[PDB]
Amino acid sequence: SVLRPLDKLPGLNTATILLVGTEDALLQQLADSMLKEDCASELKVHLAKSLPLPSSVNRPRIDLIVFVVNLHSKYSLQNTEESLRHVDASFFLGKVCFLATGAGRESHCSIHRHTVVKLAHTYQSPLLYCDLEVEGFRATMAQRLVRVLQICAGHVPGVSALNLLSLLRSSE
Amino acid sequence: MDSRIIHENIVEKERVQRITQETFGDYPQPQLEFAQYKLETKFKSSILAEREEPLRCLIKFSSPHLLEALKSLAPAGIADAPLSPLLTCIPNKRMNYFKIRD
């Protein structure tokens, strides 16, 4: 199955985000950090190891997808390259984001970050950096990601995902 | 517990937990610190298809509490749900050093 951006009608004051990665503990911590605060909207977080998802009918529509990659592991990079082939091209227009973990400790790194830079540039999407094991750093990334989610869902007038594409575009 | 979060892949997690519990039992594991395997098997993967001789390898496992590190690999996502029997058969076979042929 191929995931589609506008398959279902939106809910009332609701935003949904999907996190795809191999490390489950990091995903759980990130979801908790996102949900701890209070906001005007209603938030829902879905956790998955890879795509395609198991089939279900009650799934609400997905507004934003974040691919988190561990720089200390080749397995995570291979998993994300495999997952990237099951989402339709229409869904990359301002609704996909890449998150890279572990650049703080360079000695542990198995992946040269030229690789993730080139991957993000190839798929026309932003690339973010955060060390998710540190709670203080994770807290601010959760809020930035919540704001991006609110923009994508249509909860800020005058700004849409396609507009967000030009704001976050890199010069080279 | 925080019903806003939805855990997909839940059935896979419960299945791997059940398999690990069945394979490694529920008793406290006896404390070892080392295990050695000697391999004399053929490479089977275009690559070295014409070769007819075994590939000679020797590998060792070392841990402060072995059989406790191994038990936690599959839930953490580093191994598949059933481990190979060579790793889960230490106390039952009363074996610590192994030799494997094709």
Partner: peptide
């Protein structure tokens, strides 16, 4: 048909809620 609740029903709900293979390796070696 889990009764797709009418918008009106869902809306009031939210408003109100603001208070809460083990034989194949032993055969190869």
């Amino acid at each position: 048909r889990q009764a797709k609740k009418s918008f009106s029903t869902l809306f009031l709900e939210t408003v109100k809620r603001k208070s809460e293979d083990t034989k194949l390796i032993e055969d190869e070696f």
